[PDB]
Design a protein around this ligand. Structure first.
Ligand SMILES: *[C@@H]1O[C@H](CO)[C@@H](O)[C@H](O)[C@H]1NC(C)=O
Ligand SMILES: *[C@@H]1O[C@H](CO)[C@@H](O)[C@H](O)[C@H]1NC(C)=O
Ligand SMILES: *[C@@H]1O[C@H](CO)[C@@H](O)[C@H](O)[C@H]1NC(C)=O
Length: 606
């Protein structure tokens, strides 16, 4: 189709399957295995990317070109890696992936949306679609083309450190929130075939349904552990949202570290090939988790040759190595040359990776668009995050007795008010894990508005706002306050660091709520990733709000506290009476919640 040097896979007018087959038929085994290899930016250089024919890069949590880097700095980093990949013999562009799981959350100045538990409280799938749309724009502002989201885990035990990454313990709510996918990727056309990958073009990103499968069903909520459940239960609880993801054209699926009835997911051919590929007809690419194949063995990493064979024969397509790429490539090449892994398996993995890259337009637009840098932290997206934070809040109490005046909404005009607690003026605590650092962090880690700053922006100019992080009761009683807002809760955590058998918030938290509420009427704002022991906090408080991990836009909290909007959120999880009840889900003989799934009080706007 015309120039003397015409090569069909470079022709943007040709169907994707024809371009995939044309390119695959030209590739050496080194070029094929390179496509299957994803490496961390920290081990990448131009020569490494070219010499090893690398297919993908990622940033892990906190892996950034520098602290405070601008959107342009991110684009220049991604473009520098892409120029090396485009300089190989075949010029196959890399795809760059990142955990953009509540906005583009590793990046300074990105909008930080509420984490998924609070989004489940909104029961609003169109809000979540709009969040996917804004997230895709902020990820593309940094030159990145691929987000590892949504987590469609159905968390069945809140002792799991990833419970906050699950929309709900009710798979129907998780299924509804798969609307994140067409937000991130764009809507699929009317005649679309379920299981095909889709991305609309350069203003959207590839998505990732994760972690396949049963990551929210592990014993005692131990992260990465064993999910013990019959096939009926796996299929009725943990699997359904993957079918919704197929129908919405999710481009990739990431495998879980967890096991199902003792079989590692990263080595489970029956489920990855037999079910996901051969039954659901998934035609995008399957990616490992970070060192997921290493963790097939006990101890992890003790037989990496086996890890490679087991994972590739199970049906995984791309391996998040992410550091020991030379060993990964050498071992896989040896297995293929030895006849241990057939070429048909390599060709299927490369077909799927190429299919996603061609479909999303990566060969046509391999480089960043500098005009997109301005989308990062845009005020329209902050207004959306503020809407989502307010909708996520669940009002659990609003008066100590049935005859008390309702405390919320609070008046904006009062002579003097108190804002108190470790979480009232701490942006890192209100964002939680996966924000700037992998585990999150404390203090003013990015651009946003704390609860204290939100109160100061809300109240009448005559209202004096006093801040005290941990006042004693005497200070409160002597202060001439009309009321207090006191915010406390969990510290940031991610993955195994968040596994927690006691679910009791760190002190001082309860002590501060008791001191403040003992001195003046108080609204307690509980920041957490999950239900936590709450009876003592409730006993002390006039009103109590479960705010989850609401992100950078603390005005979503004050929008409800001062009655600009009514409270509407409803619990997306069961609130237990005691951790000795766990696991405790609807239907269990022992179901005896403090607050049931779906519970929430309301207010009317003033
Ligand atoms: C579950 O956790 C235990 C205790 O740490 C560990 O020894 C075991 O390997 C884990 N099992 C799985 C399937 O990950
Ligand atoms: C609860 O568990 C967490 C996470 O393991 C731990 O850091 C904390 O100290 C524990 N709190 C207790 C035992 O009161
Ligand atoms: C809010 O308004 C409705 C009338 O539209 C009323 O029925 C309801 O009781 C009001 N207040 C609360 C706290 O629900």
């Amino acid at each position: 189709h015309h120039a003397a040097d015409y090569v069909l896979y470079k022709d943007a007018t040709k169907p994707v399957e024809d371009r995939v087959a044309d390119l695959l038929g030209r590739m050496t085994l080194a070029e094929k295995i390179g496509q299957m290899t994803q490496i961390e930016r920290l081990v990448a250089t131009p020569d490494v990317l070219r010499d090893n024919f690398i297919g993908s890069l990622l940033s892990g949590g906190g892996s950034v070109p520098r602290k405070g880097a601008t959107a342009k700095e991110w684009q220049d980093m991604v473009d520098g890696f892409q120029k090396a990949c485009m300089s190989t013999r075949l010029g196959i562009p890399m795809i760059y992936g990142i955990d953009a799981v509540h906005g583009q959350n590793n990046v300074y100045g990105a909008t930080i949306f509420p984490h998924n538990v609070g989004l489940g409280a909104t029961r609003d799938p169109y809000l979540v679609k709009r969040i996917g749309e804004a997230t895709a724009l902020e990820v593309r502002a940094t030159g990145i083309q691929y987000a590892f989201a949504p987590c469609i885990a159905v968390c069945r035990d809140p002792r799991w450190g990833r419970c906050y990454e699950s929309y709900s313990e009710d798979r129907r709510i998780v299924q509804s929130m798969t609307e994140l996918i067409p937000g991130l990727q764009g809507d699929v056309p009317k005649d679309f075939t379920s299981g095909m990958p889709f991305v609309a073009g350069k203003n959207k990103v590839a998505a990732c349904a994760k972690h396949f499968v049963g990551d929210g069903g592990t014993v005692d909520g131990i992260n990465e552990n064993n999910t013990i459940i019959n096939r009926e239960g796996l299929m009725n609880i943990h699997m359904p949202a993957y079918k919704n993801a197929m129908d919405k054209g999710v481009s990739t699926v990431m495998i879980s570290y967890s096991s199902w009835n003792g079989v590692k997911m990263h080595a489970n051919q029956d489920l990855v090939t037999g079910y996901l590929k051969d039954t659901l007809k998934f035609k995008g690419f399957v990616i490992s988790d970070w060192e997921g194949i290493d963790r097939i063995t006990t101890p992890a990493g003790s037989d990496y040759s086996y890890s490679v064979k087991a994972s590739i024969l199970a049906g995984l397509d791309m391996i998040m190595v992410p550091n020991k790429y030379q060993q990964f490539i050498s071992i896989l090449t040896g297995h293929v040359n030895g006849g241990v892994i057939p070429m048909s398996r390599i060709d299927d993995a490369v077909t799927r990776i190429l299919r996603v890259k061609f479909t999303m337009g990566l060969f046509e637009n391999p480089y960043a668009d500098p005009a997109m840098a301005e989308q990062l932290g845009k005020q329209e997206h902050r207004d959306l995050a503020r809407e989502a934070a307010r909708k996520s809040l669940v009002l659990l109490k609003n008066g100590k007795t049935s005859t008390d005046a309702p405390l919320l909404p609070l008046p904006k005009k009062a002579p003097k008010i108190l804002v108190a607690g470790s979480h009232a003026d701490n942006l890192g605590y209100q964002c939680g894990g996966w924000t700037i650092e992998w585990q999150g962090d404390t203090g003013r880690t990015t651009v946003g508005t704390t609860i204290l700053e939100a109160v100061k922006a809300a109240v009448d100019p005559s209202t004096v706002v006093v801040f005290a992080e941990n006042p004693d009761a005497e200070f409160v009683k002597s202060g001439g306050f009309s009321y207090a807002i006191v915010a406390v809760g969990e510290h940031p955590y991610t993955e195994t660091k968040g596994d927690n058998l006691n679910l009791t918030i760190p002190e001082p938290g309860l002590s501060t709520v008791q001191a403040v509420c003992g001195g003046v009427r108080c609204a307690t704002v509980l920041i957490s990733g999950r239900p936590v022991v709450v009876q003592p906090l409730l006993a002390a408080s006039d009103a109590l709000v479960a705010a989850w991990l609401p992100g950078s836009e603390g005005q979503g909290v004050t929008d409800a506290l001062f009655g600009d909007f009514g409270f509407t959120g409803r619990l997306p999880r069961t609130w237990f009476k005691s951790v000795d009840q766990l696991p405790m889900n609807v239907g269990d003989a022992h179901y005896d919640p403090l607050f049931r799934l779906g519970y929430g009080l309301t207010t009317n706007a003033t």
